[PDB]
């Protein structure tokens, strides 16, 4: 697979450590040369130990080795491709026909599938198969689920953008509250579901649902290790402020919402700011949620298209 070995040698030399400093107490100098030469598979238990010898982060070592996924992996490339087609809709047809049939092969592929549906909806491209499959697809995927993983929250997050809330609603509830963190990418997706839900809720004026989500996000702040997304904290708080405004009816709440939206512009987040403004406009006019013209996404950052 990836050359975890070359990386190990790289780090060891850079830090001026001798081979005897790593394998001493872990393995024979003979086999170690094989691991480092990338001719012998290395076990997680071993890499972990070398990681402590070197003093360099374990996950960083994996990243340096190529775990810098999202591209090195089959499904990873498909996800980055989604961003491409969003800018070149002419590439939909061919690619969709490829993904669509393998949408239930894995939770990863399903999320990719939902990403395409969003492109089709945004470019008014026809996708008859969708409306005639989702319900069954969802049934098939979650009917007998117990515990949920990051990819699940990702799926539900992207599902909220292509399916009426009333339908996704029941799939969300079982996934919360959250009790523990399982990586930053996991913390990212679980926060996205709440952010997207809270938006649709406040938009359609479902103030009871909105409160639920505002509380779920607040709950995450009590779970040390979750690591909250700064940008989301700002966006979610602005929705929290609009929520209050719609209830306790105090111009202050509204002004705060505007102030928050403005800060996005002051810090260079032009694209996300423009989208936010477009959103405040619709809420002020009591418009229900409808896929906008501004499509926001989140890979390694909060961006627009």
């Amino acid at each position: 697979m990836f050359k975890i070995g070359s990386v190990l040698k790289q780090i060891r030399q850079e830090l001026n450590y001798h081979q005897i400093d790593l394998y001493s107490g872990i393995m024979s100098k003979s086999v170690y040369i094989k691991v480092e030469a990338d001719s012998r598979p290395i076990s997680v238990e071993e890499l972990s130990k070398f990681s402590e010898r070197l003093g360099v982060n374990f996950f960083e070592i994996l990243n340096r080795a190529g775990m810098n996924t999202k591209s090195v992996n089959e499904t990873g490339k498909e996800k980055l491709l989604i961003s491409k087609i969003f800018t070149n809709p002419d590439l939909f047809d061919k690619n969709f026909q490829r993904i669509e049939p393998k949408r239930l092969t894995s939770l990863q592929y399903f999320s990719i599938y939902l990403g395409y549906i969003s492109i089709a909806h945004h470019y008014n491209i026809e996708v008859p198969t969708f409306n005639k499959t989702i319900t069954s697809d969802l049934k098939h995927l979650y009917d007998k689920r117990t515990t949920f993983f990051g990819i699940d929250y990702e799926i539900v997050s992207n599902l909220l953008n292509v399916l009426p809330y009333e339908e996704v609603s029941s799939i969300i509830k079982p996934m919360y509250p959250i009790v523990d963190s399982f990586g930053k990418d996991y913390d990212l997706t679980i926060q996205t579901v709440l952010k997207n839900a809270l938006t649709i809720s406040i938009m359609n004026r479902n103030l009871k649902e909105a409160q639920y989500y505002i509380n779920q996000f607040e709950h995450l702040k009590t779970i040390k290790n979750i690591s909250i997304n700064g940008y989301y904290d700002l966006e979610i708080n602005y929705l929290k402020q609009i929520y209050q405004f719609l209830t306790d009816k105090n111009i202050d709440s509204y002004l705060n919402a505007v102030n928050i939206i403005n800060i996005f512009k002051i810090i260079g987040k032009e694209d996300i700011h423009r989208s936010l403004v477009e959103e405040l406009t619709k809420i002020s006019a009591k418009e229900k949620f409808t896929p906008p013209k501004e499509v926001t996404m989140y890979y390694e950052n909060y961006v627009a298209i």
Binding site: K70, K79, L80, I82, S83, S111, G115, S118, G150, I151, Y153, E154, S157, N158, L160, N161, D185, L188, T189, T192, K195, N196, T199, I200, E235, I272, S275, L276, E279, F289, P291, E294, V295, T296, M297, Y298, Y299, Y302
Partner: peptide, 7 residues
């Protein structure tokens, strides 16, 4: 906003 996530 309703954002699309991809990890």
């Amino acid at each position: 906003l309703v954002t699309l996530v991809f990890v």
